[PDB]
Design a binder for this molecule. Structure first.
Ligand SMILES: Nc1ncnc2c1ncn2[C@@H]1O[C@H](CSCC[C@H](N)C(=O)O)[C@@H](O)[C@H]1O
Length: 390
């Protein structure tokens, strides 16, 4: 019923499957409000696609269907969910992992919607008021497609007093313990934005232990809950974790504890990564593997970090405490920060330092985090293993 018209010469990407309706690409007189279903049409009134309104950035909403006759109802989501579920048969068949993503937004057909499986406890995240409107229809479909002990939610958009919490089912006591790569972690689906682990780094964590941990001093910067450290510690001589947040210490200790690792056999520091570079370098400390996985942006009073602008500083600091033979695991999650450009920054920085280097591995989102083949920013994870000689 409601219509948005494409600007001339902007049709083609949309005809070819581009899922994000860009504000700059369309105009409408139909008063598009969050929640609204609308059709995109060319200047010559050809139907292009059906989308829903959910603004983020320069974005109006997301394409949902190319079938004019398809109504956006429970049966609609039931179909996407079954397809999403079927594409994850591997995660149901593997030992050692009971937590993974079931539905990854636009990669699975609905931008702004994610569903995670934390050992039977589902976490649904909504990235706009727009997609929230469909909560009832979506929940009915969840009930029709998925098995679960409970359902939690989080609202991942501004100006909502309600933040999320328990939805239905049998509520557990948090933290609950999940398993991934035969490694145990605490999770809390009801406390602040983050759950205690980032599932998208499942395979990166595996590789770190498998290939870059044995008998090494492993440094983990911006450690959060110490997940990288926890898994690497079964192989490393010892790990060192560094995070600015007070909580990180006890949370990290506890994760070590779940895996039969004495926290006292590991090093855990609460401080700014950049301060740690100094302290480590002043005490002549060296590490064989340095994991760097910072937030895209962070602020500490006056002090700010931007992944875009400050990554060279991260690399130079690590190098000054990396062993002659050593590996850097350089990661980001910033969708705005494309792999090409990330690799460029890494290369430039390393070339400037005069060290010998080799990008040995480049990893992206795992399969449970299905990306969209016509939307490049969906591929937001970059993890680059770099072997160093200096
Ligand atoms: N300047 C800084 N120095 C060290 N840690 C920082 C920091 N600024 C933010 N952090 C921490 O970085 C974390 C962002 S989350 C990082 C997740 C982590 N890489 C993992 O593998 O799970 C937060 O815990 C935050 O406390």
């Amino acid at each position: 019923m409601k219509i948005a018209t494409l600007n001339k010469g902007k049709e083609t990407k949309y005809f070819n499957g581009y899922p994000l309706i860009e504000e700059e690409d369309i105009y409408s007189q139909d008063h598009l409000k969050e929640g609204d279903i609308f059709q995109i049409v060319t200047d010559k009134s050809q139907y292009v696609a059906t989308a829903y309104v959910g603004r983020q950035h320069k974005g109006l909403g997301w394409v949902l269907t190319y079938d004019k006759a398809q109504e956006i109802n429970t049966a609609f989501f039931v179909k996407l969910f079954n397809t999403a579920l079927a594409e994850r048969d591997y995660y149901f068949n593997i030992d050692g992992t009971n937590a993974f993503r079931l539905f990854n937004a636009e990669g699975d057909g609905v931008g702004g919607l994610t569903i995670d499986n934390y050992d039977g406890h589902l976490l649904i995240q909504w990235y706009s008021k727009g997609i929230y409107k469909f909560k009832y229809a979506i929940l009915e479909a969840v009930r029709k497609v998925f098995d679960y002990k409970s359902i939690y939610e989080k609202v991942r958009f501004k100006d909502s007093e309600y933040s999320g919490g328990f939805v239905e089912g049998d509520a557990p006591e948090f933290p609950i313990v999940i398993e991934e790569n035969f490694t145990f972690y605490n999770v809390d689906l009801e406390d602040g934005l983050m759950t205690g682990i980032f599932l998208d780094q499942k395979e990166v964590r595996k590789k770190l232990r498998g290939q870059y941990a044995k008998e090494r001093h492993v440094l983990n910067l911006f450690s959060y809950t110490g997940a990288f450290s926890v898994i690497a510690a079964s192989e490393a001589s010892s790990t060192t974790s560094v995070d600015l947040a007070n909580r990180s210490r006890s949370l990290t200790e506890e994760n070590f504890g779940l895996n039969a690792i004495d926290p006292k056999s590991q090093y855990i520091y609460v401080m700014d990564t950049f301060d740690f570079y100094k302290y480590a370098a002043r005490h002549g400390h060296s590490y064989d593997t340095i994991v760097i996985d910072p937030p895209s942006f962070a602020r500490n009073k006056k002090r700010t970090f931007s992944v875009q602008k400050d990554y060279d500083k991260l690399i130079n600091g690590a190098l000054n405490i990396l062993s002659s033979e050593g590996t850097l695991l350089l990661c980001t999650n910033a969708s705005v920060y494309p792999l090409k450009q990330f690799k460029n920054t890494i290369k430039k920085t390393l070339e400037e330092s005069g060290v010998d280097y080799e990008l040995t591995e480049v990893m992206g989102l795992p399969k449970d985090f299905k990306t969209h083949p016509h939307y490049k920013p969906s591929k937001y994870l970059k993890a680059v293993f770099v072997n160093i000689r200096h």
